[PDB]
Amino acid sequence: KMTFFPYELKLRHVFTVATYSRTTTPDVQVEIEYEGVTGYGEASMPPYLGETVESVMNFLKKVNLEQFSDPFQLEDILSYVDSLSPKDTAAKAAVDIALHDLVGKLLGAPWYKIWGLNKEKTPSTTFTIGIDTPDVVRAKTKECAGLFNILKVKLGRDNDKEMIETIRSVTDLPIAVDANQGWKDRQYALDMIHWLKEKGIVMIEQPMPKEQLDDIAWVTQQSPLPVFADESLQRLGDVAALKGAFTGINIKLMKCTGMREAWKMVTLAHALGMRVMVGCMTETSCAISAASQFSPAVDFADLDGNLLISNDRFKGVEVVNGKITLNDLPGIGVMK
Amino acid sequence: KMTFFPYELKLRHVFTVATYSRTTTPDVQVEIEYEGVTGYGEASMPPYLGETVESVMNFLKKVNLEQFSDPFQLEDILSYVDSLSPKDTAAKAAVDIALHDLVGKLLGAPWYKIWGLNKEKTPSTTFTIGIDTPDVVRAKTKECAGLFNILKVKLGRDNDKEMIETIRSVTDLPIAVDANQGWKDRQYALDMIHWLKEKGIVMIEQPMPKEQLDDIAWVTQQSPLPVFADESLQRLGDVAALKGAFTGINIKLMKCTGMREAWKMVTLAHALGMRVMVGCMTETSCAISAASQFSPAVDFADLDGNLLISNDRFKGVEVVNGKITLNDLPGIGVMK
Ligand SMILES: [Mg+2]
Ligand SMILES: [Mg+2]
């Protein structure tokens, strides 16, 4: 029995992505019940990604899980779910997450354990220092620096150098940057990378538009920092084409349809000699903890989505000494 | 606590691969104990494959599992095991199988279920009709035909056509052929495939030498039947290079180091649009059942290794209506 309902996320402060800012995030909460056990799932829909409460609710209304008598049939069930529409990846991820939570609960084990991973190998999560006045930027950097081991800064915008200079003036913490397809000039991107390297940046994400894979490859081949693909991929079938152009890939549950496909993407990337990082949207601890289950296998992680909302519905993974920390709760590791 | 000992397999009849005939098979049985629970593993070493009782026993003696207090640490443990030597894949597979059996038992579930597969989707296994005089071939074919849905024939010899016609004179069952790198001329290989298809053959395995990948791609591109790679690959790192040259890959536990890598190979092959088949050496039901755990994801399966030995130590998967049949026992699904 699957039930679902809209649950708008309330953000603590204005959150900006490229040229889009917001203080809330459409979201749908899902639950799958089987013999008295409940698995929790979630779909998060940043507006610019194309899904809405309406599209997600409508997709979920197409899903018939009552015809399936065994929750452990993840391959068959999720293949069926994927077949219902061409995309709606966040809606599909919600079903996948709830099913994994349910299955893990029935097995009495967290997915990091089912997958055979060492929870002590979880990564440090980045936390974003948003664009603002120099004084505010310096203030916010000082206020959080003591809780994280690495900070994230979004570039590919107006005053990238100034932002880095401002932040670096009050902290020596390593910085990961996301250019979000902001640099269209191949040489400018490479020069920026060298400058950022000099300023203590340790990783670069999607420096150029996905259409310019050729230019991206040229940059990565000469880059002293690992370059990760984000906008350049969504699902499993998009990974192989990036071999040789990117150092690694970024995986997000809302983009890839959930945990099962995410794990396959980790396997594929690694098998192809590529590195892996994991990201997230502003989400409750349901989706954040779900993604955290495979974090012991990633190089970088931006798993702070729940920290930006004021109405989390679950207690799941926590940031301890700046490190994503998995509890021993079965399934995706959350308590409602 | 891991213990191990040699256990030579006794074959029911002379078994021949290419020009090498034998009546026994070196094998090492492994056991890993944790809090009263025991996981069973196995290494099978057909002489021509490079490993021996000595090499396997010596490798196992290097493995320190006592330093590991959690059997669920499959990633860390098996990474460590692999790091102990360049090859010894059968010896490594033995540890992997025992660990999966143990973990599955601790979770109270068989691996097909842990992997989220539908056991009803297991494949029909081939059974081999060995080369011999026409009278014997017809007799052996008639004797087993009623228990299988597909038969295997090893070609690449000097009497391939007669062999196929002799078998076809007593049965209408589909046939899968393994040329074992027997055809050196790509034109001949292609012509043979067309001839075989007209004779009811449904799959071709390793038609040419692995050194002639270009000719293989040439054949496969215009082949009316799926072409699978066997001798052309050993492990996960060898798969990608075969994309576009082969229709699919053949996975064997003794070649790939076990279940964990095998499953990754299935994922990789499928992600790359390649099909998958699974094979085996003459083995006890331990290794056969272990490989059978992921058979619901394969297109073809040669999982009859235990049927050729007279001293099986386990009761595991069975052939029912010609289909590999998984029981509900946890781990790899065997009873000692
Ligand atoms: Mg990004
Ligand atoms: Mg073969």
UniProtKB/Swiss-Prot annotation, chains A, B:
Its cofactor is Mg(2+). This is L-Ala-D/L-Glu epimerase. Keywords: Cell wall biogenesis/degradation, Isomerase, Magnesium, Metal-binding. Binds 1 Mg(2+) ion per subunit. Mg(2+) binds at residues 178, 205, 230. Disulfide bonds: none annotated. It catalyses: L-alanyl-L-glutamate = L-alanyl-D-glutamate. It comes from Bacteroides thetaiotaomicron (strain ATCC 29148 / DSM 2079 / JCM 5827 / CCUG 10774 / NCTC 10582 / VPI-5482 / E50). Its EC number is 5.1.1.20.
